[PDB]
Amino acid sequence: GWVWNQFFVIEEYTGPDPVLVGRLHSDIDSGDGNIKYILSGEGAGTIFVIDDKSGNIHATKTLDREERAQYTLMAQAVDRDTNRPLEPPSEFIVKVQDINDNEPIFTKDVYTATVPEMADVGTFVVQVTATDADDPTYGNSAKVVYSILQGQPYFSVESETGIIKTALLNMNREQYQVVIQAKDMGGQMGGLSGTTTVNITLTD
Amino acid sequence: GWVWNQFFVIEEYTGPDPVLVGRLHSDIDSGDGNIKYILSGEGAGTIFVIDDKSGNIHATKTLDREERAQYTLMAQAVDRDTNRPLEPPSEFIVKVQDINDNEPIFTKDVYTATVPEMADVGTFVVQVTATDADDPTYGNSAKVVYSILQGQPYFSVESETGIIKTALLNMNREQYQVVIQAKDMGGQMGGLSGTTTVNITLTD
Numbered sequence: 558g559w560v561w562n563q564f565f566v567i568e569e570y571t572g573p574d575p576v577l578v579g580r581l582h583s584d585i586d587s588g589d590g591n592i593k594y595i596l597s598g599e600g601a602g603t604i605f606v607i608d609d610k611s612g613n614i615h616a617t618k619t620l621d622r623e624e625r626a627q628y629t630l631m632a633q634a635v636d637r638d639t640n641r642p643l644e645p646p647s648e649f650i651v652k653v654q655d656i657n658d659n660e661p662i663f664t665k666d667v668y669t670a671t672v673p674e675m676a677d678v679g680t681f682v683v684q685v686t687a688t689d690a691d692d693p694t695y696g697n698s699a700k701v702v703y704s705i706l707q708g709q710p711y712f713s714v715e716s717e718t719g720i721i722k723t724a725l726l727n728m729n730r731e732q733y734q735v736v737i738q739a740k741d742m743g744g745q746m747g748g749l750s751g752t753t754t755v756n757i758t759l760t761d
Numbered sequence: 762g763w764v765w766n767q768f769f770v771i772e773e774y775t776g777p778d779p780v781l782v783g784r785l786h787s788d789i790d791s792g793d794g795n796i797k798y799i800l801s802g803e804g805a806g807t808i809f810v811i812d813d814k815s816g817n818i819h820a821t822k823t824l825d826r827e828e829r830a831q832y833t834l835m836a837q838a839v840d841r842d843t844n845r846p847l848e849p850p851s852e853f854i855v856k857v858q859d860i861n862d863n864e865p866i867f868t869k870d871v872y873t874a875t876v877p878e879m880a881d882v883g884t885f886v887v888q889v890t891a892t893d894a895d896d897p898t899y900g901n902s903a904k905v906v907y908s909i910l911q912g913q914p915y916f917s918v919e920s921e922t923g924i925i926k927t928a929l930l931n932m933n934r935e936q937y938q939v940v941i942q943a944k945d946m947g948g949q950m951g952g953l954s955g956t957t958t959v960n961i962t963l964t965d
């Protein structure tokens with residue numbers, strides 16, 4: 558049930574010379590260059606190039622996991638001269654590994670909501686949503702949390718759902734402007750962040 | 762006959778933060794962290810460390826292919842809680858990939874040989890040997906070639922065997938000092954190089 562037929566590459570290779578992805582290899586390759594490795598499939602001969610005596614596969618361009626996350630390719634091993642079937646062809650996959658190179662992005666840049674005056678504490682106002690394109694296989698690198706910049710103590714926001722509620726009894730002033738931040742990494746150090754504005758209007 | 766159960770690491774990681782070697786993974790890992798990956802064997806828990814929820818394996822120190830070229834490890838997948846056998850344990854290997862970080866090195870720093878005067882052209886004199894620790898799996902990165910710095914036209918050297926021969930008929934002067942260079946990369950651009958001296962003495 559193990560899985561070994563895959564290699565990994567980092568999103569955003571901002572480096573000088575092309576990078577190695579992995580190496581194909583048949584146990585019959587005795588090191589005398591009489592065996593010819595061949596790529597084929599998604600990206601073969603373009604994004605992914607192979608040296609057919611060694612088996613090394615290289616990434617020719619810089620890849621974005623948001624554009625494509627996974628390339629499925631084929632691996633053959635033929636006889637240098639006759640090009641006969643030496644090893645049956647087998648599939649393998651290269652995974653553009655994620656980096657948290659995208660901030661949370663509020664669907665809207667401005668929300669408009671209404672809530673009644675003199676409402677009890679915890680009255681629902683509106684729910685904001687910051688989407689995050691980072692889709693790591695696992696990890697909290699894309700875990701969005703909502704916090705209230707401007708609006709306290711009048712309003713509280715729910716860290717996980719972006720639901721805004723009233724937080725002061727018996728509310729003088731008619732319109733409040735709230736600012737909510739969506740920070741990834743679970744809000745931890747170095748997390749990226751986007752913001753939005755919520756223009757609430759009390760009602761009678 | 763294909764071989765996928767191996768990862769690669771570059772010799773001489775002179776980089777700031779530790780590097781990723783590869784990732785273990787069972788097809789039953791449904792992404793809910795209920796599966797626990799385990800390392801064991803050569804270097805496990807020391808040189809090579811694993812995060813048991815992800816499966817990522819990291820190189821903690823910088824490795825030298827001249828010291829060790831190959832580490833054989835084990836891979837297990839158990840149930841987070843019961844630690845039952847979930848996937849049978851399977852071997853895999855990490856290969857410290859070569860860089861040409863070693864020059865040719867003449868066994869000796871000075872050779873002493875004798876050859877008769879008036880000898881015919883091509884008379885054997887001595888054979889020098891420059892060893893090269895770089896042992897790439899394949900490639901000419903460690904291909905040593907011998908060239909004659911000082912000694913022409915009196916002597917010629919064989920590019921591949923480091924055999925020195927007489928190259929001038931009817932040889933006035935009694936002792937000649939020859940200098941031979943051993944350059945790797947097949948002598949190509951950027952190849953490293955070591956040298957030696959050969960003090961020859963003509964005879965009657």
Ligand SMILES: [Ca+2]
Pocket residue numbers: 568569621622623658
């Ligand atoms: Ca990107």
Ligand SMILES: [Ca+2]
Pocket residue numbers: 568622623655656657658659690691692
């Ligand atoms: Ca990304």
Ligand SMILES: [Ca+2]
Pocket residue numbers: 657658659660661689690691698699700741742749
């Ligand atoms: Ca993110």
Ligand SMILES: [Ca+2]
Pocket residue numbers: 772773825826827862
């Ligand atoms: Ca070294």
Ligand SMILES: [Ca+2]
Pocket residue numbers: 772826827859860861862863894895896
């Ligand atoms: Ca080396």
Ligand SMILES: [Ca+2]
Pocket residue numbers: 861862863864865893894895902903904945946953
């Ligand atoms: Ca060398």
